[PDB]
């Protein structure tokens, strides 16, 4: 069993917890008590390898091996805020080459205010993948977490 330490960061209310809980429980919740657990384990076979993911669901890092940087596609400020999370991750790691995936969440909602192209442009400037997700429908959720594992592996 190979361990991967993943850290989920991003602005308040973007769905960091919902995403994590979807991965762990295959369930979507409309609300998450302020006091929910922030550390999770998940045993999963990824590309034939048995992994034990260690997931820290932060509030809206030296230890983390890879970062899921999350915004919501109906929250322009949360997207703008990504720059701060990226700057913070680069400082902690003293590197601009850190395993990271940019995640645009809440993709099930109508009338998005952040376009796919905008986020793709941001991810490209950082040299990282962009993946859209919905914690509600589960769209992209496995893709996001498991790509972050695949990114750590190229590292
Ligand atoms: N429609 C929809 N709602 C979502 C999605 N993800 C999260 N939500 C909702 O958005 C709200 C915030 O979700 P939550 O997971 O608590 O966000 P958070 O990023 O963990 N917040 P915090 O930083 O304060 O811990 C909740 O009402 C939750 O149900 C999604 O993909 N789609
Ligand atoms: Mg949360």
From Swiss-Prot:
SUPFAM superfamilies: P-loop containing nucleoside triphosphate hydrolases. Its EC number is 3.6.5.2. The modification N-acetylmethionine is found at residue 1. Its main location: membrane. InterPro entries: P-loop_NTPase, Small_GTP-bd, Small_GTPase, Small_GTPase_Ras-type. Changing residue 26 to G: Loss of interaction with PLCE1. Glycans are attached at residue 35. It is linked to Costello syndrome: A rare condition characterized by prenatally increased growth, postnatal growth deficiency, intellectual disability, distinctive facial appearance, cardiovascular abnormalities (typically pulmonic stenosis, hypertrophic cardiomyopathy and/or atrial tachycardia), tumor predisposition, skin and musculoskeletal abnormalities. Congenital myopathy with excess of muscle spindles: Variant of Costello syndrome. This is GTPase HRas. It comes from Homo sapiens (Human).
